[PDB]
Amino acid sequence: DYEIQRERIELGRCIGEGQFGDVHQGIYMSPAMAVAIKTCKNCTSDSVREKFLQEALTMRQFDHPHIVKLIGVITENPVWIIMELCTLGELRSFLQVRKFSLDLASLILYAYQLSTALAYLESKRFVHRDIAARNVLVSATDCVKLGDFLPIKWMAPESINFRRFTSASDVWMFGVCMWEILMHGVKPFQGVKNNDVIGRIENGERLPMPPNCPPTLYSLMTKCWAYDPSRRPRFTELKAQLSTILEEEKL
Secondary structure, eight states: OOBOOGGGEEEEEEEEEETTEEEEEEEEOOOOEEEEEEEOTTTTSHHHHHHHHHHHHHHTTOOOTTBOOEEEEEOSSSOEEEEEOOTTOBHHHHHHHHTTTOOHHHHHHHHHHHHHHHHHHHHTTOOOSOOSGGGEEEEETTEEEEOOOOOGGGOOHHHHHHOOOOHHHHHHHHHHHHHHHHTTTOOTTTTOOHHHHHHHHHTTOOOOOOTTOOHHHHHHHHHHTOSSGGGSOOHHHHHHHHHHHHHHHHO
């Protein structure tokens, strides 16, 4: 039963917005848990409420430690969706702010954790289409999660050229996200016109080996960027390889 009594939610400050309304942080109490509360300004309009609540119907289909969880809904007006809160916010910003305090083991851990979430999505034949550090959230310094699911500089060539999004294009995007993480939130193709990106890819330019990147991690990234999608790994392999690489760095 996902219905929550409104009296168990204390609305806190506005932390963001979505298409339907402001997003707040708050507390979920019982006879206390920090949560995110998505609101729907015009939820008295039946068609708007329906579309808003579809986001909750979607998220409850996923159950994974590195995907943001649906906690519940309040379906009386004002209609709210209660989600897990990732208290440290967007990963890209976190990496930029904390770059001189984050060790390599932490960066590899984030990549590993994301690969577990993406292997889970792959197991459901769900294509994400928008894997990038700005779409990852930080739950704790040792925990990142995927939440709330054109980004040309992240896209596979077949996505740019033909609008094709597949499990293999997600792997390309994950490769770019891994690069972002190892570079502490530096944007891929910084300073490059979006229109010039596909030209670089088709000339075999790839993002460079980040400082301190283990050799086997960078060749893994390189495989994610194989031009032919059939030559890219799947997430089961990525997860296994990242686990080994993480263990190597911790020891």
